[PDB]
Amino acid sequence: XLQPX
Amino acid sequence: DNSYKMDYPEMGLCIIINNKNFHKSTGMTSRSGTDVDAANLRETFRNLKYEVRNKNDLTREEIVELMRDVSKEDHSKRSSFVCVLLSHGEEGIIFGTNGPVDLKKITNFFRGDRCRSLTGKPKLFIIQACRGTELDCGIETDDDMACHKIPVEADFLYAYSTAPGYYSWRNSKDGSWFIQSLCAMLKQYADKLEFMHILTRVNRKVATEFESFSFDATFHAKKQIPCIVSMLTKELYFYHQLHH
């Protein structure tokens, strides 16, 4: 689901 | 001339740099969902009649070589230029698979004095990447001069996914919040609205419709606003109106 760049 | 001339024979290139897999030594995690963004962008800009070139997993050296080579093409028959960067980032920086590239090094190839066949034409850089480690927790609701010149920094537009200093967020299944929203707003509105107004709708969509969900409280219930940076000198429409 959520991942940072 | 309140609007850029967009009736050259070609709308122009749309270069998409899609960096998913990074060198083990960098510590950067695989960007799950980026191929969804890369495919969305390709279809979206296809429908706007851009010549799309997708490139995947470029090193920092390969990014610079690509941008140099593209800037050296003859763009005389093209209305505009678009570059989309999908990667990890920090303020002012995009990552190659093996390390950082300054964004300024990339965009400098296209300066008005360095890419003469794009002088006077809109140069768009669309950047999905973090710009730092801040988290947005949100809040509940005389002289004419003779020789005419233009600035070498004029006619650029940087559509950043997030505000200076902040995280930018991506969904492993659906793609990045910003690119999802950008493609949706271009699909819906590029046949009528001016580009700043399309990007303002992208701002509202990202701001209102997304909120992070994380098992790690540190990254949970976070928000994002994109950041439109325009040095454009005219209105930009992705269509032209035939005279007959």
Domains of chain B are 1-244 (3.40.50.1460)
Do residues A4 and B221 touch, judged by C-beta distance below 8 A?
Answer: no
Q: Which of these is catalytic: B14, B75, B88, B227?
A: B88
In angstroms, what CA-CA distances link B150 with B105, B111, B232? 21, 11, 12
Q: Please give the backbone phi and psi of residue B45, each rounded to the nearest 5 degrees, phi first.
A: -75, -25
Among residues 1-5 of chain A, which lie with CB inside 8 Å of chain B?
1-5
Crossing angle between the packed helical segments B177-189 and B195-209, to the nearest 10 degrees:
130
Q: What single-letter DSSP state applies at residue B133?
A: S
Sheet with B89-90, side-by-side order of all strands: B89-90, B93-96, B99-102
Question: Tokens in use for B222?
Answer: 């976070």
Task: Choose the closest CB to A3 out of B89, B161, B170.
Answer: B170
Q: Which of these is catalytic: B14, B115, B130, B227?
A: B130
Searching chain B, which residue's CA lies closest to the CA of residue A5? B88
Within 8 A of B130 by CB-CB distance, chain A residues are: 4-5
- Is B43 exposed, middle or buried (CB count within 10 Å of its CB: 0-12, 13-18, 19+)? exposed
Separation in Å, CA of B124 to nearest CA in chain A: 21
Residue B113, phi-psi category: left (phi > 0), alpha (psi -120 to 50), beta (remainder): alpha
* A4/B167 CB distance under 8 A: yes
DSSP class per residue in B148-163: ----TTTTEEEEESS-
Do residues B83 and B17 touch, judged by C-beta distance below 8 A?
Answer: yes
Q: What single-letter DSSP state applies at residue B223?
A: B
Is B88 marked active-site?
yes
* A5/B214 CB distance under 8 A: no
Name residue B159's amino acid.
Answer: A
CA B62 to chain centre: 18
Name the nearest CA neighbour of B18 among B45, B44, B36: B36
CB count in 10 Å sphere of residue B92: 12
CB count in 10 Å sphere of residue B9: 8
- This structure's resolution (angstroms)? 1.6
Sheet with A2-4, side-by-side order of all strands: A2-4, B169-171, B175-176
In angstroms, what CA-CA distances link B124 with A1, B80, B160? 29, 8, 11
How determined? X-ray
Do residues B85 and B56 touch, judged by C-beta distance below 8 A?
Answer: no
Non-local CB neighbours of B239 within 8 Å, separated by 6+ positions: B6, B190, B191
A vs B: CB pairs below 8 A: 40
